[PDB]
Amino acid sequence: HILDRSEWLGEPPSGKYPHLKLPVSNIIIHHTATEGCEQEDVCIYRMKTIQAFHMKSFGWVDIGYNFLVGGDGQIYVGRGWHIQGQHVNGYGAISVSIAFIGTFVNMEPPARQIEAAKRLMDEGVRLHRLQPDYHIYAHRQLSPTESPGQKLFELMQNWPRFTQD
């Protein structure tokens, strides 16, 4: 279940932003450092609120992430596959971001949230958005941040395609 901008009731982007050359080789895992969401209506509310924060507080053209996944086990489309993402605690790696909605410092995401990210990535490969040999990194490997949270970072150690280096 993938909710696009029309389904999470988002605003259109306020301007253009550099395109991503596809397929991309890297996925970067974030957390949103907000409350999590375990049912669609709450996830949609969170998405709207995060988009507003990014657009109004930071002045960005759109919610910063390419994709987000909710504790409801659903995928939320942010900027999508074709547009470069933007992130607090920035980095320049050519990649697509997936933000786990929530804060995973001392709690883990439910299985269904992790499974949503996995499903998103396999679809990326099928539709030629992600290279077949793509690698997965944590935001904190690339920038001085806690993101995606200690507990989620621990879980990632055993993920297929997770790259320590």
| 2 part of the interface to Cu ion, by CB under 5 A | yes
Compute how many residues bind Cu ion; rule: CB under 5 A: 1
| 52 part of the interface to Cu ion, by CB under 5 A | no
| 107 part of the interface to Cu ion, by CB under 5 A | no
User: With contact defined as beta carbons under 8 Å apart, do 99 and 67 qualify?
Assistant: yes
Both tokens of 148, joined, read 């995606």
Contacts of 96 (CB under 8 A, 6+ apart): 20, 24, 26, 27, 28, 66, 67, 81, 85, 124, 129, 130
With respect to Cu ion, which residue has the nearer C-beta, 2 or 52? 2
With respect to Cu ion, which residue has the nearer C-beta, 71 or 149? 71
Strands (E), 107-156: 130-138
Q: Which stretch binds Cu ion (CB under 5 A): 2-10, 13-21, 51-59, 84-92?
A: 2-10
